[PDB]
Design a protein around this ligand. Structure first.
Ligand code: O22
Length: 258
């Protein structure tokens, strides 16, 4: 019911996430301010460990570079456990997406800008998140912020190959373009109400479909003509043909307000 980090005590309001020996708690400090504490039980290969160490260091470093990256106020690391005190936000994008029926065009555009800026920041520092999904983004102050960089083991709020890029499947035996496809699927869902290959319930079929150039993705007409173009450009199977993050930041959909 209580946790301590660097001589500071927090009260466990509730658990909001879980994973491989890892938990996320909604907490309050002495002055009743709210924060998110990530607990990691280190009793974990030399490698799983180094993966958490790497994530912590990049998250910390990347703090200064963008307000679209989640805030890490402090952390406690020992041979037994890891405690991470960070911004708590309102709710993760994945949970919020399920509760809302329709999404506002302005909100969708603002959110897309946030995601783009966050992924852009991590790319400039040589990080390619490799598993991008809505659960990786947190809604804080009517704005989206990136929670993790996909370096450490992934957690889930309290998996699917829907957002999986084709190059990652073909290369079965790394480019920043992979994050573009994933972002495209998130925006596609934000626009059409589902991921491009959501219907395929058969997984090996879904996989074959994601990679097959003959399997055409549906882009039914909409009033925002730019959005439709963004989606088309983001969902190019060939990574070389696929639009880049710097190009997406200069796209009319993001640049020109309607
Ligand atoms: C699994 C969620 O993980 C996190 N959720 C956070 N916020 C959060 C997550 C989920 C909810 C929710 N859906 O209740 C509300 C807030 C903040 C974090 N800093 C982290 C981390 N790490």
């Amino acid at each position: 019911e209580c946790i301590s980090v660097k001589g500071r005590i927090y009260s466990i309001l509730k658990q909001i996430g879980s994973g491989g020996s890892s938990k996320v708690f909604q907490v309050l400090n002495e002055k009743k301010q709210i924060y998110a504490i990530k607990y990691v039980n280190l009793e974990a290969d030399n490698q799983t460990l180094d993966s958490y160490r790497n994530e912590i260091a990049y998250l910390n470093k990347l703090q200064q570079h963008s307000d679209k990256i989640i805030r890490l106020y402090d952390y406690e690391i020992t041979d037994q456990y890891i405690y991470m005190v960070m911004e708590c936000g309102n709710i993760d994008l994945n949970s919020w997406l399920k509760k809302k029926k329709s999404i506002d065009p302005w909100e969708r555009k603002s959110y897309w800008k946030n995601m783009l800026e966050a992924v852009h920041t991590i790319h400039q520092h040589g990080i390619v998140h490799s598993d991008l999904k809505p659960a990786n983004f947190l809604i804080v102050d009517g704005m989206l912020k990136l929670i993790d960089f996909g370096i450490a083991n992934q957690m889930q709020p309290d998996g699917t190959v829907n957002y999986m890029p084709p190059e990652a499947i073909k290369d079965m035996s790394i480019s920043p373009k992979s994050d573009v496809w994933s972002l495209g699927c998130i925006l596609y869902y934000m626009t059409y109400g589902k991921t491009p290959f959501q219907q395929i319930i058969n997984q090996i079929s879904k996989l074959h479909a994601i990679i097959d150039p003959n399997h055409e993705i549906e882009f039914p007409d909409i009033p925002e003509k730019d959005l439709q173009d963004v989606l088309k450009c983001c969902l190019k199977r060939d990574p070389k043909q696929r639009i880049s993050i710097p190009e997406l930041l200069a796209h009319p959909y993001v640049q020109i307000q309607t």
